[PDB]
Amino acid sequence: WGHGKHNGPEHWHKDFPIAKGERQSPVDIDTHTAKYDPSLKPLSVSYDQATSLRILNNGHAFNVEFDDSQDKAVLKGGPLDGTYRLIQFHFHWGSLDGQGSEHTVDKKKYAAELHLVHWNTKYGDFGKAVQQPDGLAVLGIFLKVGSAKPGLQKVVDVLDSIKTKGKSADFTNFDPRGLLPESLDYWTYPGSLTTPPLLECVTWIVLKEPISVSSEQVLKFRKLNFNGEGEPEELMVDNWRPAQPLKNRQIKASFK
Numbered sequence: 001w002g003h004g005k006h007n008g009p010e011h012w013h014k015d016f017p018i019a020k021g022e023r024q025s026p027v028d029i030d031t032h033t034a035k036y037d038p039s040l041k042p043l044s045v046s047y048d049q050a051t052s053l054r055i056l057n058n059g060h061a062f063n064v065e066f067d068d069s070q071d072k073a074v075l076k077g078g079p080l081d082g083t084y085r086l087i088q089f090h091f092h093w094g095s096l097d098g099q100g101s102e103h104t105v106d107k108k109k110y111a112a113e114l115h116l117v118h119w120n121t122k123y124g125d126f127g128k129a130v131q132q133p134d135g136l137a138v139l140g141i142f143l144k145v146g147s148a149k150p151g152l153q154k155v156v157d158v159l160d161s162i163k164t165k166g167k168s169a170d171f172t173n174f175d176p177r178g179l180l181p182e183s184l185d186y187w188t189y190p191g192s193l194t195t196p197p198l199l200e201c202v203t204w205i206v207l208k209e210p211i212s213v214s215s216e217q218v219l220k221f222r223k224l225n226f227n228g229e230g231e232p233e234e235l236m237v238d239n240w241r242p243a244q245p246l247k248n249r250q251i252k253a254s255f256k
C-alpha cells in the first residue's frame with residue numbers, strides 16, 4: 001500500500017477491511033457542531049526530559065523516534081485517563097500549499113499536519129497498546145505557510161541524509177516543545193491511525209491553533225522520496241488520507 005494512484009487510500013479496504021470501520025480517521029471538524037464539554041481537563045504536556053533518538057524515512061513519511069522506555073516525555077489530562085508516552089512524531093504534507101493536512105476544519109485544508117504519537121502506559125508497550133480502544137493518544141497540529149518556524153529547522157536540515165526509503169540518521173537532543181503552538185485549546189474524538197493497519201485505538205487531540213512554517217521549510221519536505229536508494233525517483237508528497245464519515249461519533253471542544 002501507499003498513497004499513489006494504484007495503491008492509495010481508495011485501495012486500502014482490500015488488504016485492511018477496517019478501512020470502512022466505525023471510527024476511522026481523519027475526519028472533517030465542524031466548528032459549529034462540535035460541542036463544548038466543560039468537563040475536559042486542560043492538556044498536560046511534559047516534554048522537558050524528552051530524549052529524541054533517530055529520524056528515518058520509512059517510505060511513507062519520516063519519523064523522529066524517542067526513547068519511550070520511561071516516563072520522560074508524556075501527555076496526560078484532557079480527555080485522557082492515565083499516562084501516555086511519546087514514541088514518535090511525523091508529518092503529512094501535500095504537493096501544494098492548499099492541501100496536505102489529514103484533518104480539515106470546516107472543510108479547510110492546511111499545508112500539512114503534525115502527529116505526535118503516544119501510547120497508554122498501562123499496556124506495557126506500543127504493540128499491545130494499538131490493540132486497545134484507548135491505547136494511543138495522537139496530538140495533531142496543523143501547519144500553515146507563512147513565517148518560518150525556528151524550532152523546526154533542525155529537522156529540515158537533516159532531511160538530505162534520509163532522502164530515500166530505509167535511510168535513518170542519528171537525531172539526538174531535539175526538543176519537541178519547539179513545535180507546539182501558543183495555545184492548547186483542542187477538539188477531541190475517538191478515531192484510528194491514518195495509515196494501515198489503520199487500527200481504531202486512538203483518542204485524537206487536534207489543536208485549534210496551527211503553527212506557521214516558511215515556504216522554504218515545507219519545500220524541503222517535498223524533496224524526499226517514497227522509493228529506496230535503488231528505484232526510480234518518486235517524490236514524497238500528498239501522503240495524507242481523505243476525511244472519513246463521522247458516523248456515530250461526536251467531536252468535543254475544550255473551548256467555546
Ligand SMILES: [Zn+2]
Nearest residue numbers: 090092115194
Ligand atoms: Zn500521521
